[PDB]
Amino acid sequence: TPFMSNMTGWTTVNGTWADTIEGKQGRSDGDSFILSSASGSDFTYESDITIKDGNGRGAGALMFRSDKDAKNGYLANVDAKHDLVKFFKFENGAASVIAEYKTPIDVNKKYHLKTEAEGDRFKIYLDDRLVIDAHDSVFSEGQFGLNVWDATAVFQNVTKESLEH
């Protein structure tokens, strides 16, 4: 398929997700989620993310250590509207920010975003530059997925690698 990933069983939670020439595209006003069947504890997880025209030109995100309905877990995003990389958590569907890094995020520019999750430590890299290195102990394991917020965004080369504890 046109979506390149080393993970399978991608199943929509909500929103509109479709594979395009450019990868897997999500589009929603508000938040939307798709989850892979794959789970992980400690890992690297990464994607190319491009925010397209449309909606609110908001955010595209990696989601990880997620429960099955994406109401609990962690996200690392690129947010064109607010020029941020944000690391945050959903708990019972409510978001709380763990750390964020203000940096220009423009529409129609490909970004690479990578998270290294080891124990309760999370390192997040934008275009291979470490931008957040923070701790949170709420969730230790769960599913991988993707999200978009007030945006159309496309994800390509979505890969994970499990790490030893």
Swiss-Prot record:
Single GO biological process annotation from the record: sucrose catabolic process
Question: What are this entry's molecular-function GO terms?
Answer: fructan beta-fructosidase activity; sucrose alpha-glucosidase activity
Q: What induces it?
A: Induced by low concentrations of fructose, but not by sucrose. Repressed by glucose or high concentrations of fructose.
Q: Which domain of life is it from?
A: Bacteria
* Gene Ontology cellular component terms for the protein in this record: cytoplasm; extracellular region
- Annotated compartments: Secreted
Q: Does the keyword Secreted apply?
A: yes
Tell me if Secreted is a UniProt keyword of this record: yes
Recite the UniProt keywords alphabetically.
Answer: Carbohydrate metabolism, Glycosidase, Hydrolase, Secreted, Signal
Recorded family membership: Belongs to the glycosyl hydrolase 32 family.
**Further comment found in the protein's record:** Levanase cannot be detected in the wild-type B.subtilis but is mostly secreted into the culture medium by SacL mutants, especially at the end of the exponential growth phase.
Could you identify this protein by its name? Levanase
* Taxonomic source organism: Bacillus subtilis (strain 168)
Question: What would be the name of the gene that encodes this protein?
Answer: sacC
Boundaries of the shown chain within the full protein: 516 to 677 of 677
